[PDB]
Design a protein around this motif. Structure first.
Motif, PDB file in Angstrom:
ATOM      1  N   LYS A 214      -0.874  -2.033  -3.939  1.00  0.00           N
ATOM      2  CA  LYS A 214      -0.644  -1.687  -2.785  1.00  0.00           C
ATOM      3  C   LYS A 214      -1.110  -0.517  -2.478  1.00  0.00           C
ATOM      4  O   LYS A 214      -1.012   0.600  -3.414  1.00  0.00           O
ATOM      5  CB  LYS A 214       1.032  -1.767  -2.561  1.00  0.00           C
ATOM      6  CG  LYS A 214       1.580  -0.788  -1.529  1.00  0.00           C
ATOM      7  CD  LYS A 214       2.946  -1.052  -1.207  1.00  0.00           C
ATOM      8  CE  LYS A 214       3.367  -0.463   0.133  1.00  0.00           C
ATOM      9  NZ  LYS A 214       4.944  -0.363   0.189  1.00  0.00           N
TER      10      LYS A 214
ATOM     11  N   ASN B  67      -2.687   4.590  -3.844  1.00  0.00           N
ATOM     12  CA  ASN B  67      -2.919   3.178  -4.587  1.00  0.00           C
ATOM     13  C   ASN B  67      -2.188   3.173  -5.819  1.00  0.00           C
ATOM     14  O   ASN B  67      -2.555   3.707  -6.795  1.00  0.00           O
ATOM     15  CB  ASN B  67      -4.500   3.122  -4.642  1.00  0.00           C
ATOM     16  CG  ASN B  67      -4.758   1.583  -4.922  1.00  0.00           C
ATOM     17  OD1 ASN B  67      -4.014   0.796  -5.067  1.00  0.00           O
ATOM     18  ND2 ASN B  67      -6.103   1.341  -4.997  1.00  0.00           N
ATOM     19  N   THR B  68      -1.267   1.979  -5.684  1.00  0.00           N
ATOM     20  CA  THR B  68      -0.610   1.766  -7.060  1.00  0.00           C
ATOM     21  C   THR B  68      -1.341   1.098  -8.264  1.00  0.00           C
ATOM     22  O   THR B  68      -1.133   1.045  -9.304  1.00  0.00           O
ATOM     23  CB  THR B  68       0.821   0.761  -6.663  1.00  0.00           C
ATOM     24  OG1 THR B  68       0.247  -0.526  -6.157  1.00  0.00           O
ATOM     25  CG2 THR B  68       1.818   1.459  -5.556  1.00  0.00           C
ATOM     26  N   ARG B  69      -2.392   0.443  -7.645  1.00  0.00           N
ATOM     27  CA  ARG B  69      -3.226  -0.280  -8.629  1.00  0.00           C
ATOM     28  C   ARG B  69      -4.323   0.473  -9.324  1.00  0.00           C
ATOM     29  O   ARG B  69      -4.743  -0.071 -10.553  1.00  0.00           O
ATOM     30  CB  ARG B  69      -3.474  -1.657  -7.950  1.00  0.00           C
ATOM     31  CG  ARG B  69      -2.870  -2.903  -8.254  1.00  0.00           C
ATOM     32  CD  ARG B  69      -3.018  -4.113  -7.860  1.00  0.00           C
ATOM     33  NE  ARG B  69      -2.898  -4.717  -6.292  1.00  0.00           N
ATOM     34  CZ  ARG B  69      -1.766  -5.057  -5.639  1.00  0.00           C
ATOM     35  NH1 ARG B  69      -0.656  -5.350  -6.397  1.00  0.00           N
ATOM     36  NH2 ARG B  69      -1.846  -4.965  -4.103  1.00  0.00           N
TER      37      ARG B  69
ATOM     38  N   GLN C 198       2.823  -1.719 -10.542  1.00  0.00           N
ATOM     39  CA  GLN C 198       3.617  -2.495  -9.456  1.00  0.00           C
ATOM     40  C   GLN C 198       3.321  -1.941  -8.207  1.00  0.00           C
ATOM     41  O   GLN C 198       3.109  -0.875  -8.063  1.00  0.00           O
ATOM     42  CB  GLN C 198       5.077  -2.811 -10.209  1.00  0.00           C
ATOM     43  CG  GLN C 198       5.330  -3.240 -11.362  1.00  0.00           C
ATOM     44  CD  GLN C 198       6.633  -3.085 -11.778  1.00  0.00           C
ATOM     45  OE1 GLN C 198       7.549  -4.037 -11.050  1.00  0.00           O
ATOM     46  NE2 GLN C 198       7.116  -2.241 -12.599  1.00  0.00           N
ATOM     47  N   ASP C 199       3.649  -2.941  -7.046  1.00  0.00           N
ATOM     48  CA  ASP C 199       3.934  -2.541  -5.766  1.00  0.00           C
ATOM     49  C   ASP C 199       5.180  -1.579  -5.521  1.00  0.00           C
ATOM     50  O   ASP C 199       5.195  -0.774  -4.772  1.00  0.00           O
ATOM     51  CB  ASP C 199       3.754  -3.703  -4.890  1.00  0.00           C
ATOM     52  CG  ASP C 199       2.286  -4.272  -4.571  1.00  0.00           C
ATOM     53  OD1 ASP C 199       1.317  -3.879  -5.063  1.00  0.00           O
ATOM     54  OD2 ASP C 199       2.526  -5.072  -3.673  1.00  0.00           O
ATOM     55  N   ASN C 200       6.095  -2.074  -6.064  1.00  0.00           N
ATOM     56  CA  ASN C 200       7.326  -1.121  -6.165  1.00  0.00           C
ATOM     57  C   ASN C 200       7.113   0.185  -7.142  1.00  0.00           C
ATOM     58  O   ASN C 200       7.056  -0.251  -8.065  1.00  0.00           O
ATOM     59  CB  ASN C 200       8.579  -2.136  -6.387  1.00  0.00           C
ATOM     60  CG  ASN C 200       9.733  -1.162  -6.526  1.00  0.00           C
ATOM     61  OD1 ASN C 200       9.902  -0.428  -7.466  1.00  0.00           O
ATOM     62  ND2 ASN C 200      10.598  -1.251  -5.481  1.00  0.00           N
TER      63      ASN C 200
END
Length: 130
Positions: free
Chosen positions: A1, A39-41, A86-88
């Motif tokens: 995310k 960006n979490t990714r 993760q997105d969280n």
């Protein structure tokens, strides 16, 4: 995310990052901004020492999470590096909190010194309602 600036500001406040170990929310925002562009990714392989930086805060596999492939590494946050993609961001935040519990604090990330220290970081949180 990929978070929006104010959306992350609000999330981090709720997760209790404001003033954690003396670090203001604006500092955490500045770090996330330069490390991953929110960006979490985000992942970055360091060919230099065979470690990889993971997630929104670009947390390094040599000392903070386990990726199995980093030689002579430790896992101080007690997490799979996967957890930081993760997105969280609850695991990422808990880990970031663990990093600043060491003497260096926020200085643990070289880019904080280059890009955020001694700067007017108010910009990262203006108008977010934090």
């Amino acid at each position: 995310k990929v978070f929006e600036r104010c959306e992350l500001a609000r999330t981090l406040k709720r997760l209790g990052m404001d003033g954690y170990r003396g670090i203001s929310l604006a500092n955490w925002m500045c770090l996330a901004k330069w490390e991953s562009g929110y960006n979490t990714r985000a992942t970055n392989y360091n060919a230099g020492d065979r470690s990889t930086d993971y997630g929104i805060f670009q947390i390094n596999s040599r000392y903070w999470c386990n990726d199995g492939k980093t030689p002579g590494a430790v896992n101080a946050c007690h997490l799979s590096c996967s957890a930081l993609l993760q997105d969280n961001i609850a695991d990422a935040v808990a880990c970031a909190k663990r990093v600043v519990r060491d003497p260096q604090g926020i200085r643990a990330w070289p880019a904080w010194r280059n890009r955020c220290q001694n700067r007017d970081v108010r910009q990262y949180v203006q108008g977010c309602g934090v």
